[PDB]
Amino acid sequence: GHSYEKYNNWETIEAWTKQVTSENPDLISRTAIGTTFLGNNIYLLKVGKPGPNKPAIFMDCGFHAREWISHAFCQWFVREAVLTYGYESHMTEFLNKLDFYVLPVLNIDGYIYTWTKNRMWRKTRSTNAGTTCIGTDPNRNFDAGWCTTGASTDPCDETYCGSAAESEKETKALADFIRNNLSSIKAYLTIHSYSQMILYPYSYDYKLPENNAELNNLAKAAVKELATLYGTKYTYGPGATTIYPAAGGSDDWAYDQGIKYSFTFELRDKGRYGFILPESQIQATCEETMLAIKYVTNYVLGHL
Numbered sequence: 001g002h003s004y005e006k007y008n009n010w011e012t013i014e015a016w017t018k019q020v021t022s023e024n025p026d027l028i029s030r031t032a033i034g035t036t037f038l039g040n041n042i043y044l045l046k047v048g049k050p051g052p053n054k055p056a057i058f059m060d061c062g063f064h065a066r067e068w069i070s071h072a073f074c075q076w077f078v079r080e081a082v083l084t085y086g087y088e089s090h091m092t093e094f095l096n097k098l099d100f101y102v103l104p105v106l107n108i109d110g111y112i113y114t115w116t117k118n119r120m121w122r123k124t125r126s127t128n129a130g131t132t133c134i135g136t137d138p139n140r141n142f143d144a145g146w147c148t149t150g151a152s153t154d155p156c157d158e159t160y161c162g163s164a165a166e167s168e169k170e171t172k173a174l175a176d177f178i179r180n181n182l183s184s185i186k187a188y189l190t191i192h193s194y195s196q197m198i199l200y201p202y203s204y205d206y207k208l209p210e211n212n213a214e215l216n217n218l219a220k221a222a223v224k225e226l227a228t229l230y231g232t233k234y235t236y237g238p239g240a241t242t243i244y245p246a247a248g249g250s251d252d253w254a255y256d257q258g259i260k261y262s263f264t265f266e267l268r269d270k271g272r273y274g275f276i277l278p279e280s281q282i283q284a285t286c287e288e289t290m291l292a293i294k295y296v297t298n299y300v301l302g303h304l
């Protein structure tokens, strides 16, 4: 039993990716871009009205296992897309002109572990040579000033950066896909919780991106837009000064690949519930986040 207003286990999310695609083949195609360490299927949903040489926006959720509202959002987004296409003018235009590559859960193995054993698990579930300690932090595992700051070289730590960039099957799979589709991908959006922020590069260094004024203006408008719905307040800015320095993140890596619009979203809340956000806040959290995501999309589309 899948529900968009409950957190769903992987078995249910997987069955959902099959069902939602089957029921909406004129708007969704499902491919697998690789397997996790434990052999689970890394699904990618291409959401859009099919057509030749379309530009794309890439969005993932579930980098971090315990951030359950992230996984919830990707599912919510997909339904909004399919239900409102042809009726809401913006979404109709969006899906006509571009594709959303939606990766609903990246770190599946960790997510399963938060259901079966440890709700506060963060990392992947890969083994590490020479120790019983498990897991690499996927968002320390990208080739972006890799492991030089805000990251641990110790496999027993929560921010373990891995043995090398893309040492994890899951991060290699994501990197490979984006690398193979660079010409088409115009924005990279990665969904996390919590903190209510929109961050842009850089986090691995205090240097600012060439278009940081544009990114600041874009982030500022998106947070204003998000707030219009329920009054939820977000902050925004470069990662390093806005939250903390940290190397090896996918947002910084995607930007350095030439994807000029790259954002990490941190959804509700600010720490009252933290990672354990009540299911009763799924709907409102997803609704307001939709506004910010659609705002950014509208901007990116208009600036092709």
Ligand SMILES: CC(C)[C@H](NC(=O)[C@H](Cc1ccc(O)cc1)NC(=O)OCc1ccccc1)P(=O)(O)O[C@H](C(=O)O)c1cccc(NC(=N)N)c1
Pocket: 064, 067, 139, 140, 158, 159, 192, 193, 194, 195, 199, 203, 204, 239, 243, 245, 246, 247, 248, 249, 250, 251, 252, 264, 266
């Ligand atoms: C609550 C979120 C802020 C998450 N952070 C955590 O869970 C961190 C991870 C961590 C664990 C041990 C340690 O020694 C240092 C850090 N843990 C934690 O308790 O966060 C609490 C907190 C809550 C609010 C603001 C700051 C910190 P996140 O989603 O993992 O944050 C991302 C990350 O650290 O990978 C993140 C946030 C903003 C930008 C980026 N991009 C990037 N390239 N670093 C990445």
Ligand SMILES: [Zn+2]
Pocket: 063, 064, 067, 192, 193
């Ligand atoms: Zn996270």
